[PDB]
mmCIF file of all heavy atoms in Angstrom:
data_model
loop_
_atom_site.group_PDB
_atom_site.id
_atom_site.type_symbol
_atom_site.label_atom_id
_atom_site.label_comp_id
_atom_site.label_asym_id
_atom_site.label_seq_id
_atom_site.Cartn_x
_atom_site.Cartn_y
_atom_site.Cartn_z
ATOM 1 N N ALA A 138 -108.979 -121.468 -102.433
ATOM 2 C CA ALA A 138 -110.193 -121.044 -101.755
ATOM 3 C C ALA A 138 -111.427 -121.757 -102.300
ATOM 4 O O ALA A 138 -111.502 -122.113 -103.480
ATOM 5 C CB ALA A 138 -110.376 -119.532 -101.882
ATOM 6 N N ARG A 139 -112.395 -121.970 -101.414
ATOM 7 C CA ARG A 139 -113.727 -122.430 -101.778
ATOM 8 C C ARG A 139 -114.704 -121.284 -101.563
ATOM 9 O O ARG A 139 -114.765 -120.713 -100.469
ATOM 10 C CB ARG A 139 -114.141 -123.649 -100.951
ATOM 11 C CG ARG A 139 -115.541 -124.157 -101.257
ATOM 12 C CD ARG A 139 -115.936 -125.299 -100.333
ATOM 13 N NE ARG A 139 -115.052 -126.453 -100.465
ATOM 14 C CZ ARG A 139 -115.161 -127.376 -101.415
ATOM 15 N NH1 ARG A 139 -116.120 -127.283 -102.327
ATOM 16 N NH2 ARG A 139 -114.311 -128.393 -101.456
ATOM 17 N N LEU A 140 -115.451 -120.940 -102.607
ATOM 18 C CA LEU A 140 -116.367 -119.813 -102.538
ATOM 19 C C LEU A 140 -117.625 -120.190 -101.768
ATOM 20 O O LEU A 140 -118.171 -121.284 -101.936
ATOM 21 C CB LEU A 140 -116.736 -119.339 -103.945
ATOM 22 C CG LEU A 140 -115.574 -118.975 -104.871
ATOM 23 C CD1 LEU A 140 -116.091 -118.325 -106.146
ATOM 24 C CD2 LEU A 140 -114.584 -118.060 -104.165
ATOM 25 N N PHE A 141 -118.078 -119.275 -100.914
ATOM 26 C CA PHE A 141 -119.305 -119.444 -100.140
ATOM 27 C C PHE A 141 -120.222 -118.270 -100.452
ATOM 28 O O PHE A 141 -119.956 -117.140 -100.027
ATOM 29 C CB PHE A 141 -119.009 -119.531 -98.643
ATOM 30 C CG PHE A 141 -118.464 -120.862 -98.207
ATOM 31 C CD1 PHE A 141 -117.172 -121.237 -98.536
ATOM 32 C CD2 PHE A 141 -119.243 -121.736 -97.469
ATOM 33 C CE1 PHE A 141 -116.667 -122.460 -98.138
ATOM 34 C CE2 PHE A 141 -118.743 -122.961 -97.066
ATOM 35 C CZ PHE A 141 -117.452 -123.322 -97.401
ATOM 36 N N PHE A 142 -121.291 -118.535 -101.195
ATOM 37 C CA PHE A 142 -122.266 -117.513 -101.549
ATOM 38 C C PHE A 142 -123.408 -117.547 -100.539
ATOM 39 O O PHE A 142 -124.074 -118.575 -100.382
ATOM 40 C CB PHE A 142 -122.778 -117.733 -102.972
ATOM 41 C CG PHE A 142 -121.690 -117.724 -104.009
ATOM 42 C CD1 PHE A 142 -121.579 -118.755 -104.929
ATOM 43 C CD2 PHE A 142 -120.771 -116.688 -104.056
ATOM 44 C CE1 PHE A 142 -120.575 -118.748 -105.881
ATOM 45 C CE2 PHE A 142 -119.767 -116.675 -105.005
ATOM 46 C CZ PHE A 142 -119.669 -117.707 -105.918
ATOM 47 N N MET A 143 -123.630 -116.422 -99.860
ATOM 48 C CA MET A 143 -124.570 -116.347 -98.748
ATOM 49 C C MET A 143 -125.770 -115.452 -99.035
ATOM 50 O O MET A 143 -126.581 -115.217 -98.134
ATOM 51 C CB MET A 143 -123.852 -115.857 -97.490
ATOM 52 C CG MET A 143 -122.653 -116.697 -97.095
ATOM 53 S SD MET A 143 -123.126 -118.280 -96.380
ATOM 54 C CE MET A 143 -124.172 -117.736 -95.032
ATOM 55 N N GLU A 144 -125.905 -114.944 -100.262
ATOM 56 C CA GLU A 144 -127.003 -114.033 -100.564
ATOM 57 C C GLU A 144 -128.359 -114.729 -100.554
ATOM 58 O O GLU A 144 -129.381 -114.059 -100.372
ATOM 59 C CB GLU A 144 -126.772 -113.352 -101.915
ATOM 60 C CG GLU A 144 -127.172 -114.186 -103.120
ATOM 61 C CD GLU A 144 -126.282 -115.395 -103.316
ATOM 62 O OE1 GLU A 144 -125.068 -115.293 -103.037
ATOM 63 O OE2 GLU A 144 -126.795 -116.447 -103.749
ATOM 64 N N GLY A 145 -128.396 -116.045 -100.737
ATOM 65 C CA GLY A 145 -129.635 -116.788 -100.674
ATOM 66 C C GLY A 145 -130.247 -117.171 -102.002
ATOM 67 O O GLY A 145 -131.354 -117.721 -102.015
ATOM 68 N N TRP A 146 -129.575 -116.897 -103.114
ATOM 69 C CA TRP A 146 -130.064 -117.310 -104.417
ATOM 70 C C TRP A 146 -129.577 -118.721 -104.742
ATOM 71 O O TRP A 146 -128.675 -119.262 -104.098
ATOM 72 C CB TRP A 146 -129.611 -116.332 -105.501
ATOM 73 C CG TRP A 146 -130.363 -115.032 -105.518
ATOM 74 C CD1 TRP A 146 -129.838 -113.782 -105.371
ATOM 75 C CD2 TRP A 146 -131.774 -114.856 -105.704
ATOM 76 N NE1 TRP A 146 -130.834 -112.838 -105.449
ATOM 77 C CE2 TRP A 146 -132.031 -113.470 -105.653
ATOM 78 C CE3 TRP A 146 -132.845 -115.733 -105.906
ATOM 79 C CZ2 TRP A 146 -133.313 -112.942 -105.796
ATOM 80 C CZ3 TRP A 146 -134.117 -115.206 -106.049
ATOM 81 C CH2 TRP A 146 -134.341 -113.824 -105.993
ATOM 82 N N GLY A 147 -130.190 -119.317 -105.759
ATOM 83 C CA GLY A 147 -129.772 -120.611 -106.249
ATOM 84 C C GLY A 147 -128.562 -120.503 -107.157
ATOM 85 O O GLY A 147 -127.878 -119.480 -107.225
ATOM 86 N N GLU A 148 -128.299 -121.601 -107.871
ATOM 87 C CA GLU A 148 -127.183 -121.624 -108.813
ATOM 88 C C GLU A 148 -127.307 -120.510 -109.844
ATOM 89 O O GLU A 148 -126.307 -119.889 -110.224
ATOM 90 C CB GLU A 148 -127.105 -122.984 -109.507
ATOM 91 C CG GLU A 148 -126.629 -124.118 -108.618
ATOM 92 C CD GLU A 148 -126.166 -125.322 -109.415
ATOM 93 O OE1 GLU A 148 -126.461 -125.382 -110.628
ATOM 94 O OE2 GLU A 148 -125.505 -126.206 -108.833
ATOM 95 N N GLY A 149 -128.524 -120.234 -110.300
ATOM 96 C CA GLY A 149 -128.737 -119.197 -111.285
ATOM 97 C C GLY A 149 -128.391 -119.660 -112.685
ATOM 98 O O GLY A 149 -127.911 -120.770 -112.921
ATOM 99 N N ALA A 150 -128.633 -118.764 -113.639
ATOM 100 C CA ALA A 150 -128.508 -119.083 -115.054
ATOM 101 C C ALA A 150 -127.065 -119.158 -115.541
ATOM 102 O O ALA A 150 -126.847 -119.510 -116.704
ATOM 103 C CB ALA A 150 -129.274 -118.052 -115.887
ATOM 104 N N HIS A 151 -126.077 -118.842 -114.697
ATOM 105 C CA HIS A 151 -124.694 -118.785 -115.160
ATOM 106 C C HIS A 151 -123.729 -119.411 -114.160
ATOM 107 O O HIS A 151 -122.567 -118.999 -114.077
ATOM 108 C CB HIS A 151 -124.271 -117.341 -115.444
ATOM 109 C CG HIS A 151 -125.244 -116.583 -116.294
ATOM 110 N ND1 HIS A 151 -125.222 -116.625 -117.671
ATOM 111 C CD2 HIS A 151 -126.270 -115.764 -115.959
ATOM 112 C CE1 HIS A 151 -126.191 -115.865 -118.149
ATOM 113 N NE2 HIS A 151 -126.842 -115.332 -117.131
ATOM 114 N N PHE A 152 -124.182 -120.419 -113.410
ATOM 115 C CA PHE A 152 -123.363 -120.995 -112.348
ATOM 116 C C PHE A 152 -122.069 -121.612 -112.868
ATOM 117 O O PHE A 152 -121.109 -121.741 -112.099
ATOM 118 C CB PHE A 152 -124.162 -122.046 -111.577
ATOM 119 C CG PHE A 152 -123.601 -122.356 -110.220
ATOM 120 C CD1 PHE A 152 -123.454 -121.357 -109.272
ATOM 121 C CD2 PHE A 152 -123.219 -123.645 -109.891
ATOM 122 C CE1 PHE A 152 -122.939 -121.637 -108.020
ATOM 123 C CE2 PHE A 152 -122.702 -123.934 -108.641
ATOM 124 C CZ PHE A 152 -122.562 -122.928 -107.705
ATOM 125 N N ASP A 153 -122.019 -121.996 -114.145
ATOM 126 C CA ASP A 153 -120.781 -122.534 -114.701
ATOM 127 C C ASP A 153 -119.662 -121.501 -114.682
ATOM 128 O O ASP A 153 -118.486 -121.861 -114.556
ATOM 129 C CB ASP A 153 -121.017 -123.029 -116.128
ATOM 130 C CG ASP A 153 -121.807 -124.320 -116.175
ATOM 131 O OD1 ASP A 153 -122.097 -124.879 -115.096
ATOM 132 O OD2 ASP A 153 -122.137 -124.777 -117.290
ATOM 133 N N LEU A 154 -120.006 -120.216 -114.802
ATOM 134 C CA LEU A 154 -118.985 -119.173 -114.822
ATOM 135 C C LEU A 154 -118.338 -119.000 -113.454
ATOM 136 O O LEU A 154 -117.126 -118.780 -113.359
ATOM 137 C CB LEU A 154 -119.593 -117.855 -115.299
ATOM 138 C CG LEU A 154 -120.197 -117.875 -116.703
ATOM 139 C CD1 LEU A 154 -120.532 -116.466 -117.164
ATOM 140 C CD2 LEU A 154 -119.248 -118.553 -117.680
ATOM 141 N N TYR A 155 -119.133 -119.085 -112.383
ATOM 142 C CA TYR A 155 -118.564 -119.022 -111.041
ATOM 143 C C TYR A 155 -117.617 -120.189 -110.798
ATOM 144 O O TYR A 155 -116.590 -120.035 -110.128
ATOM 145 C CB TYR A 155 -119.676 -119.012 -109.993
ATOM 146 C CG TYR A 155 -120.550 -117.781 -110.030
ATOM 147 C CD1 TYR A 155 -121.757 -117.783 -110.716
ATOM 148 C CD2 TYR A 155 -120.171 -116.616 -109.375
ATOM 149 C CE1 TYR A 155 -122.561 -116.659 -110.752
ATOM 150 C CE2 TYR A 155 -120.967 -115.488 -109.405
ATOM 151 C CZ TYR A 155 -122.162 -115.515 -110.094
ATOM 152 O OH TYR A 155 -122.957 -114.393 -110.125
ATOM 153 N N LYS A 156 -117.944 -121.364 -111.344
ATOM 154 C CA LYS A 156 -117.090 -122.534 -111.179
ATOM 155 C C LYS A 156 -115.735 -122.362 -111.852
ATOM 156 O O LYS A 156 -114.778 -123.050 -111.476
ATOM 157 C CB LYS A 156 -117.787 -123.777 -111.735
ATOM 158 C CG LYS A 156 -118.994 -124.234 -110.933
ATOM 159 C CD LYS A 156 -119.601 -125.487 -111.541
ATOM 160 C CE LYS A 156 -120.723 -126.041 -110.679
ATOM 161 N NZ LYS A 156 -121.376 -127.222 -111.311
ATOM 162 N N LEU A 157 -115.632 -121.474 -112.844
ATOM 163 C CA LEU A 157 -114.341 -121.221 -113.474
ATOM 164 C C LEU A 157 -113.367 -120.600 -112.483
ATOM 165 O O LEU A 157 -112.183 -120.956 -112.457
ATOM 166 C CB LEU A 157 -114.518 -120.323 -114.697
ATOM 167 C CG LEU A 157 -115.289 -120.957 -115.854
ATOM 168 C CD1 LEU A 157 -115.414 -119.983 -117.012
ATOM 169 C CD2 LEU A 157 -114.619 -122.247 -116.303
ATOM 170 N N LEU A 158 -113.842 -119.672 -111.663
ATOM 171 C CA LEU A 158 -113.078 -119.265 -110.494
ATOM 172 C C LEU A 158 -113.160 -120.360 -109.437
ATOM 173 O O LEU A 158 -114.210 -120.982 -109.251
ATOM 174 C CB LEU A 158 -113.605 -117.941 -109.945
ATOM 175 C CG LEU A 158 -114.013 -116.896 -110.987
ATOM 176 C CD1 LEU A 158 -114.583 -115.656 -110.315
ATOM 177 C CD2 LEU A 158 -112.835 -116.528 -111.878
ATOM 178 N N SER A 159 -112.031 -120.608 -108.757
ATOM 179 C CA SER A 159 -111.841 -121.663 -107.764
ATOM 180 C C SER A 159 -111.741 -123.035 -108.425
ATOM 181 O O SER A 159 -112.472 -123.327 -109.383
ATOM 182 C CB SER A 159 -112.963 -121.655 -106.718
ATOM 183 O OG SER A 159 -113.128 -122.932 -106.130
ATOM 184 N N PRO A 160 -110.820 -123.887 -107.965
ATOM 185 C CA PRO A 160 -110.859 -125.305 -108.340
ATOM 186 C C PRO A 160 -111.798 -126.130 -107.478
ATOM 187 O O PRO A 160 -111.951 -127.330 -107.729
ATOM 188 C CB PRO A 160 -109.399 -125.761 -108.146
ATOM 189 C CG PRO A 160 -108.611 -124.505 -107.817
ATOM 190 C CD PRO A 160 -109.590 -123.550 -107.237
ATOM 191 N N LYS A 161 -112.412 -125.520 -106.468
ATOM 192 C CA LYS A 161 -113.348 -126.192 -105.583
ATOM 193 C C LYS A 161 -114.778 -125.821 -105.955
ATOM 194 O O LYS A 161 -115.038 -124.748 -106.503
ATOM 195 C CB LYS A 161 -113.078 -125.823 -104.122
ATOM 196 C CG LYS A 161 -111.629 -125.999 -103.697
ATOM 197 C CD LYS A 161 -111.525 -126.860 -102.451
ATOM 198 C CE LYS A 161 -110.141 -127.471 -102.308
ATOM 199 N NZ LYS A 161 -109.116 -126.458 -101.940
ATOM 200 N N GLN A 162 -115.700 -126.721 -105.655
ATOM 201 C CA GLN A 162 -117.110 -126.464 -105.913
ATOM 202 C C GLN A 162 -117.614 -125.386 -104.964
ATOM 203 O O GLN A 162 -117.528 -125.564 -103.741
ATOM 204 C CB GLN A 162 -117.923 -127.742 -105.746
ATOM 205 C CG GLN A 162 -119.429 -127.540 -105.830
ATOM 206 C CD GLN A 162 -119.931 -127.499 -107.259
ATOM 207 O OE1 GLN A 162 -119.271 -127.991 -108.175
ATOM 208 N NE2 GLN A 162 -121.104 -126.909 -107.460
ATOM 209 N N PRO A 163 -118.124 -124.262 -105.463
ATOM 210 C CA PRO A 163 -118.705 -123.259 -104.567
ATOM 211 C C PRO A 163 -119.925 -123.816 -103.849
ATOM 212 O O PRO A 163 -120.592 -124.741 -104.317
ATOM 213 C CB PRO A 163 -119.087 -122.109 -105.508
ATOM 214 C CG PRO A 163 -119.160 -122.728 -106.864
ATOM 215 C CD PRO A 163 -118.152 -123.833 -106.871
ATOM 216 N N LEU A 164 -120.207 -123.240 -102.686
ATOM 217 C CA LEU A 164 -121.333 -123.644 -101.862
ATOM 218 C C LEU A 164 -122.343 -122.509 -101.771
ATOM 219 O O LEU A 164 -121.966 -121.339 -101.651
ATOM 220 C CB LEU A 164 -120.877 -124.045 -100.456
ATOM 221 C CG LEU A 164 -120.757 -125.544 -100.172
ATOM 222 C CD1 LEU A 164 -119.467 -126.101 -100.745
ATOM 223 C CD2 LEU A 164 -120.847 -125.817 -98.678
ATOM 224 N N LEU A 165 -123.619 -122.862 -101.838
ATOM 225 C CA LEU A 165 -124.704 -121.917 -101.635
ATOM 226 C C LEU A 165 -125.199 -122.008 -100.196
ATOM 227 O O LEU A 165 -124.945 -122.986 -99.489
ATOM 228 C CB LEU A 165 -125.849 -122.188 -102.615
ATOM 229 C CG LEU A 165 -125.434 -122.210 -104.088
ATOM 230 C CD1 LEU A 165 -126.625 -122.509 -104.984
ATOM 231 C CD2 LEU A 165 -124.781 -120.893 -104.481
ATOM 232 N N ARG A 166 -125.907 -120.961 -99.766
ATOM 233 C CA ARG A 166 -126.357 -120.899 -98.379
ATOM 234 C C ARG A 166 -127.315 -122.037 -98.054
ATOM 235 O O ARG A 166 -127.305 -122.567 -96.937
ATOM 236 C CB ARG A 166 -127.015 -119.548 -98.099
ATOM 237 C CG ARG A 166 -127.187 -119.251 -96.618
ATOM 238 C CD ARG A 166 -127.748 -117.859 -96.393
ATOM 239 N NE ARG A 166 -129.083 -117.708 -96.964
ATOM 240 C CZ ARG A 166 -129.926 -116.733 -96.641
ATOM 241 N NH1 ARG A 166 -129.575 -115.817 -95.749
ATOM 242 N NH2 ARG A 166 -131.122 -116.673 -97.211
ATOM 243 N N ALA A 167 -128.151 -122.427 -99.020
ATOM 244 C CA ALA A 167 -129.101 -123.507 -98.780
ATOM 245 C C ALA A 167 -128.396 -124.825 -98.487
ATOM 246 O O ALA A 167 -128.907 -125.645 -97.715
ATOM 247 C CB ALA A 167 -130.037 -123.658 -99.980
ATOM 248 N N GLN A 168 -127.221 -125.046 -99.080
ATOM 249 C CA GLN A 168 -126.470 -126.272 -98.841
ATOM 250 C C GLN A 168 -125.800 -126.303 -97.473
ATOM 251 O O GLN A 168 -125.270 -127.351 -97.091
ATOM 252 C CB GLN A 168 -125.405 -126.463 -99.923
ATOM 253 C CG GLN A 168 -125.921 -126.375 -101.348
ATOM 254 C CD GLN A 168 -124.797 -126.368 -102.367
ATOM 255 O OE1 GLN A 168 -124.405 -125.314 -102.869
ATOM 256 N NE2 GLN A 168 -124.267 -127.546 -102.672
ATOM 257 N N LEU A 169 -125.808 -125.193 -96.733
ATOM 258 C CA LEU A 169 -125.068 -125.136 -95.476
ATOM 259 C C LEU A 169 -125.754 -125.954 -94.388
ATOM 260 O O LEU A 169 -125.097 -126.717 -93.669
ATOM 261 C CB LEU A 169 -124.901 -123.683 -95.030
ATOM 262 C CG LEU A 169 -123.853 -122.851 -95.773
ATOM 263 C CD1 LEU A 169 -123.511 -121.597 -94.984
ATOM 264 C CD2 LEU A 169 -122.602 -123.671 -96.055
ATOM 265 N N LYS A 170 -127.078 -125.808 -94.254
ATOM 266 C CA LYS A 170 -127.809 -126.515 -93.204
ATOM 267 C C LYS A 170 -127.613 -128.023 -93.297
ATOM 268 O O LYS A 170 -127.741 -128.730 -92.291
ATOM 269 C CB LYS A 170 -129.300 -126.166 -93.273
ATOM 270 C CG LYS A 170 -129.729 -125.061 -92.319
ATOM 271 C CD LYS A 170 -131.228 -124.808 -92.389
ATOM 272 C CE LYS A 170 -131.616 -123.559 -91.613
ATOM 273 N NZ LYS A 170 -131.654 -122.356 -92.485
ATOM 274 N N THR A 171 -127.308 -128.531 -94.495
ATOM 275 C CA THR A 171 -127.037 -129.954 -94.666
ATOM 276 C C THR A 171 -125.851 -130.412 -93.823
ATOM 277 O O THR A 171 -125.851 -131.537 -93.309
ATOM 278 C CB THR A 171 -126.782 -130.258 -96.146
ATOM 279 O OG1 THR A 171 -127.955 -129.951 -96.910
ATOM 280 C CG2 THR A 171 -126.417 -131.721 -96.352
ATOM 281 N N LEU A 172 -124.850 -129.549 -93.646
ATOM 282 C CA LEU A 172 -123.592 -129.961 -93.035
ATOM 283 C C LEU A 172 -123.640 -130.000 -91.512
ATOM 284 O O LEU A 172 -122.866 -130.748 -90.906
ATOM 285 C CB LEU A 172 -122.470 -129.033 -93.499
ATOM 286 C CG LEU A 172 -122.448 -128.812 -95.014
ATOM 287 C CD1 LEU A 172 -121.808 -127.479 -95.371
ATOM 288 C CD2 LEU A 172 -121.744 -129.962 -95.722
ATOM 289 N N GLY A 173 -124.513 -129.228 -90.882
ATOM 290 C CA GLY A 173 -124.619 -129.258 -89.437
ATOM 291 C C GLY A 173 -125.247 -127.993 -88.901
ATOM 292 O O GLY A 173 -125.378 -126.986 -89.596
ATOM 293 N N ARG A 174 -125.635 -128.066 -87.624
ATOM 294 C CA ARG A 174 -126.251 -126.916 -86.970
ATOM 295 C C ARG A 174 -125.250 -125.792 -86.741
ATOM 296 O O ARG A 174 -125.640 -124.619 -86.682
ATOM 297 C CB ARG A 174 -126.871 -127.333 -85.638
ATOM 298 C CG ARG A 174 -128.273 -127.905 -85.745
ATOM 299 C CD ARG A 174 -128.658 -128.624 -84.462
ATOM 300 N NE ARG A 174 -127.748 -129.729 -84.174
ATOM 301 C CZ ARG A 174 -127.682 -130.362 -83.007
ATOM 302 N NH1 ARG A 174 -128.475 -130.000 -82.008
ATOM 303 N NH2 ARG A 174 -126.820 -131.356 -82.838
ATOM 304 N N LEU A 175 -123.968 -126.121 -86.607
ATOM 305 C CA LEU A 175 -122.941 -125.136 -86.286
ATOM 306 C C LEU A 175 -121.705 -125.425 -87.126
ATOM 307 O O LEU A 175 -120.981 -126.390 -86.860
ATOM 308 C CB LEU A 175 -122.604 -125.159 -84.797
ATOM 309 C CG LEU A 175 -121.608 -124.103 -84.316
ATOM 310 C CD1 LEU A 175 -122.228 -122.716 -84.370
ATOM 311 C CD2 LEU A 175 -121.122 -124.422 -82.914
ATOM 312 N N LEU A 176 -121.471 -124.592 -88.137
ATOM 313 C CA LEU A 176 -120.240 -124.621 -88.909
ATOM 314 C C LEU A 176 -119.227 -123.639 -88.328
ATOM 315 O O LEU A 176 -119.591 -122.596 -87.777
ATOM 316 C CB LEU A 176 -120.505 -124.269 -90.375
ATOM 317 C CG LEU A 176 -121.295 -125.233 -91.253
ATOM 318 C CD1 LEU A 176 -122.471 -124.499 -91.879
ATOM 319 C CD2 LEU A 176 -120.389 -125.801 -92.324
ATOM 320 N N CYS A 177 -117.944 -123.987 -88.453
ATOM 321 C CA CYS A 177 -116.843 -123.121 -88.044
ATOM 322 C C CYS A 177 -115.749 -123.194 -89.101
ATOM 323 O O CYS A 177 -115.221 -124.276 -89.377
ATOM 324 C CB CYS A 177 -116.297 -123.527 -86.669
ATOM 325 S SG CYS A 177 -117.412 -123.139 -85.249
ATOM 326 N N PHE A 178 -115.428 -122.056 -89.710
ATOM 327 C CA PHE A 178 -114.369 -121.977 -90.711
ATOM 328 C C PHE A 178 -113.027 -121.793 -90.009
ATOM 329 O O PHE A 178 -112.843 -120.821 -89.270
ATOM 330 C CB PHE A 178 -114.624 -120.814 -91.673
ATOM 331 C CG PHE A 178 -115.978 -120.851 -92.325
ATOM 332 C CD1 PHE A 178 -117.102 -120.395 -91.652
ATOM 333 C CD2 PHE A 178 -116.124 -121.318 -93.620
ATOM 334 C CE1 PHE A 178 -118.346 -120.428 -92.249
ATOM 335 C CE2 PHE A 178 -117.362 -121.349 -94.224
ATOM 336 C CZ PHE A 178 -118.477 -120.903 -93.538
ATOM 337 N N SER A 179 -112.093 -122.722 -90.234
ATOM 338 C CA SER A 179 -110.752 -122.561 -89.685
ATOM 339 C C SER A 179 -110.030 -121.357 -90.276
ATOM 340 O O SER A 179 -109.135 -120.806 -89.627
ATOM 341 C CB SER A 179 -109.924 -123.825 -89.918
ATOM 342 O OG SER A 179 -110.070 -124.293 -91.247
ATOM 343 N N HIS A 180 -110.408 -120.934 -91.482
ATOM 344 C CA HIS A 180 -109.742 -119.821 -92.152
ATOM 345 C C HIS A 180 -110.678 -119.306 -93.237
ATOM 346 O O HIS A 180 -110.875 -119.982 -94.251
ATOM 347 C CB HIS A 180 -108.409 -120.270 -92.737
ATOM 348 C CG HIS A 180 -107.519 -119.140 -93.150
ATOM 349 N ND1 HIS A 180 -106.432 -119.317 -93.979
ATOM 350 C CD2 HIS A 180 -107.554 -117.822 -92.849
ATOM 351 C CE1 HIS A 180 -105.835 -118.154 -94.171
ATOM 352 N NE2 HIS A 180 -106.497 -117.231 -93.497
ATOM 353 N N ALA A 181 -111.247 -118.119 -93.030
ATOM 354 C CA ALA A 181 -112.240 -117.579 -93.946
ATOM 355 C C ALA A 181 -111.998 -116.096 -94.186
ATOM 356 O O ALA A 181 -111.724 -115.342 -93.250
ATOM 357 C CB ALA A 181 -113.662 -117.784 -93.410
ATOM 358 N N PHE A 182 -112.106 -115.692 -95.448
ATOM 359 C CA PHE A 182 -112.092 -114.290 -95.835
ATOM 360 C C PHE A 182 -113.510 -113.863 -96.192
ATOM 361 O O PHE A 182 -114.257 -114.624 -96.813
ATOM 362 C CB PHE A 182 -111.153 -114.051 -97.020
ATOM 363 C CG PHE A 182 -109.694 -114.198 -96.682
ATOM 364 C CD1 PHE A 182 -109.116 -115.452 -96.567
ATOM 365 C CD2 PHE A 182 -108.900 -113.080 -96.482
ATOM 366 C CE1 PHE A 182 -107.773 -115.588 -96.257
ATOM 367 C CE2 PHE A 182 -107.557 -113.209 -96.173
ATOM 368 C CZ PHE A 182 -106.993 -114.465 -96.060
#
């Protein structure tokens, strides 16, 4: 899984700890608009 944090905060003071969970780089909500106007997850929990 790749973590998607949607609360709207930045990396924060402990972002290294979130990276320990998941082998993928987590994404923040601010980084989403970079990818396109309309994202669609093929498989999301």
Side-chain angles (χ1 to χ4, degrees):
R139 178 184 299 278
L140 305 189
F141 283 72
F142 302 129
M143 304 286 304
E144 82 292 325
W146 285 121
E148 288 197 346
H151 311 274
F152 199 59
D153 287 355
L154 300 191
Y155 295 96
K156 291 181 174 177
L157 293 180
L158 320 177
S159 155
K161 309 233 159 71
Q162 173 83 21
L164 259 79
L165 306 179
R166 195 176 63 163
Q168 308 172 261
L169 284 197
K170 263 183 189 93
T171 298
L172 312 154
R174 276 165 300 166
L175 184 70
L176 292 125
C177 288
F178 306 81
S179 46
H180 194 196
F182 290 78

